[PDB]
Write a protein that binds this DNA or RNA. Sequence first.
RNA 1: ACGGGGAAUCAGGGUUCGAUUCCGGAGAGGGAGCCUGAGAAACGGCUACCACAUCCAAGGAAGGCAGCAGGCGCGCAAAUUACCCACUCCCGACCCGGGGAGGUAGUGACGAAAAAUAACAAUACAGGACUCUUUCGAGGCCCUGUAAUUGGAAUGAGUCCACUUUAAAUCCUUUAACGAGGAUCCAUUGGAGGGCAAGUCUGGUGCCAGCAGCCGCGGUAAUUCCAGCUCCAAUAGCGUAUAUUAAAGUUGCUGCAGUUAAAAAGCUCGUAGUUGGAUCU
Lengths: 56, 180, 615, 29
Amino acid sequence: GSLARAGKVRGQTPKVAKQEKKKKKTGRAKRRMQYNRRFVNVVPTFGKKKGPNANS
Amino acid sequence: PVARSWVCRKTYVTPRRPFEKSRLDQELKLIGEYGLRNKREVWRVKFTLAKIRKAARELLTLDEKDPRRLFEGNALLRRLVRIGVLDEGKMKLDYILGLKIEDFLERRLQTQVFKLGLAKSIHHARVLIRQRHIRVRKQVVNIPSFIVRLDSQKHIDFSLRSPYGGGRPGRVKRKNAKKG
Amino acid sequence: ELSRVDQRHRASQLRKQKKEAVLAEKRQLGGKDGPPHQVLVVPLHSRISLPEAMQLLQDGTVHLNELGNTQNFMLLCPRLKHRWFFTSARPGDLHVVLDMAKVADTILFLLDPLEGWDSTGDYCLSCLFAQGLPTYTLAVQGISGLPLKKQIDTRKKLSKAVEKRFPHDKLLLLDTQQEAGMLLRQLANQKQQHLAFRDRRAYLFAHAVDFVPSEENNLVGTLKISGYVRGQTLNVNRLLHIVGYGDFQMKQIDAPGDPFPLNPKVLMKADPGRQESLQAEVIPDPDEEAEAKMLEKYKQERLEEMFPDEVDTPRDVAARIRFQKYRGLKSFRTSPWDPKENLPQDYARIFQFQNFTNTRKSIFKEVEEKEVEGAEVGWYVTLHVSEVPVSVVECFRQGTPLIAFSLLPHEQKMSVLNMVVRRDPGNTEPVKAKEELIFHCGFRRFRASPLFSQHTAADKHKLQRFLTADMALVATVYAPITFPPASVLLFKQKSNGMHSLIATGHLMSVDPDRMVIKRVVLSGHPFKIFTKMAVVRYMFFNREDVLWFKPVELRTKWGRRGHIKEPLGTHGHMKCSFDGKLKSQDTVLMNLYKRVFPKWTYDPYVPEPVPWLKS
Amino acid sequence: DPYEDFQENWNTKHSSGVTRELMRELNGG
RNA sequence: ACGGGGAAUCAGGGUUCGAUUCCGGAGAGGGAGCCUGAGAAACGGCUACCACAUCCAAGGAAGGCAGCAGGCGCGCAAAUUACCCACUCCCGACCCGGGGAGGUAGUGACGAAAAAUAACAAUACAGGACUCUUUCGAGGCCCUGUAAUUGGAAUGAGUCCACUUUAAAUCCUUUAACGAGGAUCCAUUGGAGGGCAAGUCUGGUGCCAGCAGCCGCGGUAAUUCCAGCUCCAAUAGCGUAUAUUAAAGUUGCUGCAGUUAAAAAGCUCGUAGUUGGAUCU
């Protein structure tokens, strides 16, 4: 077929730049952070919505 | 021809199913409870338990008056009493099968520094071992997964060159004394 | 294969087949007979002064053949019994690099220990990669001049910062001549990259240029150019192109004694008039205002990357007058088109081919499979040319060398060259479809005015009015015929004569039969929609031209095909049947097409660029 | 409501996602 | 296809790899013949022939890296033309000489082991939990952070004298001195429809570009493409391709199937094979 469209959407996309945030965490302190998020001080709250990264 | 030894051995096994909830959950609870770094430190202590269960499960098919079971089975329980995982009255070969991961993880040097009160958190023990502040009977130990034997539990202290036990202050206190 | 011995035999033939074919071109370079081993050396980082290193590699026996500014000498060390030849150039200078790194066999890069290269060396590095790289070797100068610990890091802190240009190569350092003694061996035993251009034409390098004019008042005379022949068998009845001063015919060759033999005057050919081809390119018988242009060229370019050809329809002049010349195609690829319907008067001034590939394979066979009576390679042949002006002489006394090479038959006339370009992302400036650009198309140098086009396999080709950064485009211009393949470079003077490299690429087929098509898109708007009918405001304004453009098919921006059915307004409205139901968001628009031809702005003169720096 | 979104969209392209979400609601922790 | 010792995987049975450092065989470009010697059909010995190929003054002369380095070629595919006999041992007339055997460095994310990238405290929260108040709300009692809030205390990575190591060096170990607040001395590789952990959030494209192992996604509201944010998994490592093993009771001895899903020979006789009834203190 016609090869003329190649990289159409890759070059058509509006170029948004990545926003600067802090250095994340690494290693044992990251595992401590995600253990503290999920297990100790889990929220007595709207259960069965146990879908972190729930949009709305 | 060389005078080298190529005899090595892997110390962990990865699970058969990679994305399994409540395997992930249980190992994350064991990572957070004992201050470990990654999953591979649980998969390592799961592997030395699976070697001990398997060798006892082999020794349970030979009869009670076997030579090999009486020798090698009494030498298996002796190590498990020696590192403090088993007790002394439970030295039949069938309280080996009632051991768990947590019995083996309570004997690391990290949790013992936390248990004796030389730290104030399980992550404070990792740094205090790793910064070379912790010695066992004379010797500075720099490794957190150093399984503390039963006789070496009474001698865990603060490493006579350190600012915590010894007394010559560190890098930071002396510079603030220079700026005094 | 069959049975273990006719498999071991079958491997031995194909091993012998490959192992003998790799040897049939190894003796093309640097034998005992010895066309000399030309090694061009350039430093990248401007901290590296070039007289620092060349003195160290001077001594077997050194023969300083003096030039204008740079010392371009020859070397003989007969403990390994080879004849090296060393030329040297400077980073960023487009003139003195590109003219003798094109006939060179080996390029020797000199990298700095600290960084990889400065900004200006990266410029001439980009042109050399696109010109066709010969055998290349990295080298560094100041490694052991660092402390005894800080040198095992400096090769290691460098050699990953080279790989985004140079993916893998070891780095031979230069501190001693016992370090350089391991360089000339590494230089000697390489894999010879074969430049596919030069192994069909007979070229030469200037060792000593001598001149005496015929007359002094007309400022033109005859040269005594001397140097080794390094190409094919140099025929006497072929033409001769100096790379910077046009094409002409010579009158006498003669082979003097070799001034530099490895281990230590006769006239043989003369030019007749019966075989010599005639020199004629054509057939004889018939500041802020430019910134105001700059800010709109950051905008009129950007009317092309969001709108394809959204023009304004003419409100004053009738539609059969403004867009008279165009036509509408039912299908852009499967339509008929007469390729010679409207020939311009410039196309009566160019030369045609009966079949370009089959006349290429017959002119490719005769240089290789047929032996001509010309002088064979490896010799030292000086040369008398007929009529070259005096301006080529004193610039050689400034230091630049003059390169002359023979031409194939039918390489002096005019035709329509098509050539694939890719826009170099080192430049960010927009280029119109009919600009003036410096072309380096296979040892030639000329200014031109091309036609940018799209790279498809169908016969028609749609004009791209500007230069894009990702699609590979085709330039199309009148130029002298160069047989493919040929490496292309494209430059543009930004300011102070600094040549900005904007496009690299290679050569397509030279032919006038390539249909480049200029489009124009007529945009309208449907404002009363019905069940499979539509009333289109604003596309036309008169009533009568709707019947003119009625057979021209319609399209929408949402993929719907359609056509004009009737007009209904005395003003510019119309009824149009369609295939889907039109949406309220749509914009129906039609395509008009016509042929386009490039301009004849050919000039063989190029201004000599300045030392290329930054701003 | 995962019940309704499952009972409606069990047939559509989003069936696997709404079954995932319904098991998340029913099983729960 | 060099063979073994062995290696990978594995419930039990199995399957596949084993050129490769130990033992045994063979061979020094391809065949062949010898000399010497206790031992060789020896190639870092010789003589021929076939194949390549070096010098040459054209009469002649000399070759054999599947030794260590290094080069070319081949290819998806593999390191330094380095130092030393100090170690382990071997040869010799020998306590003394020699050894690219071997040792030591260099290159090396083949692979395997340990293991940093932060810890702590005081505040405040329209955070949680424990005692009271019917409830508002009362507390150093225990925890948590989208606090780029404050605060000193701890330390390596580096930079670097010295010792130590070694044949001599390096490296690690040991010690001076400097060495952390966006502790910018920033952790990456794949993914977020289901298999399968984790967003029908926002912008763009509109069966296009492309994604997708499989099912499928994309035709103007894309949970799947191109991106931004957020989240997930492993983590100094993680994707991809191919070989192979398990999954495979989809090769089945353990342990499969054969009416209709793939499949019982048209029927019978028959030698080899395989299998054969009770019975002896």
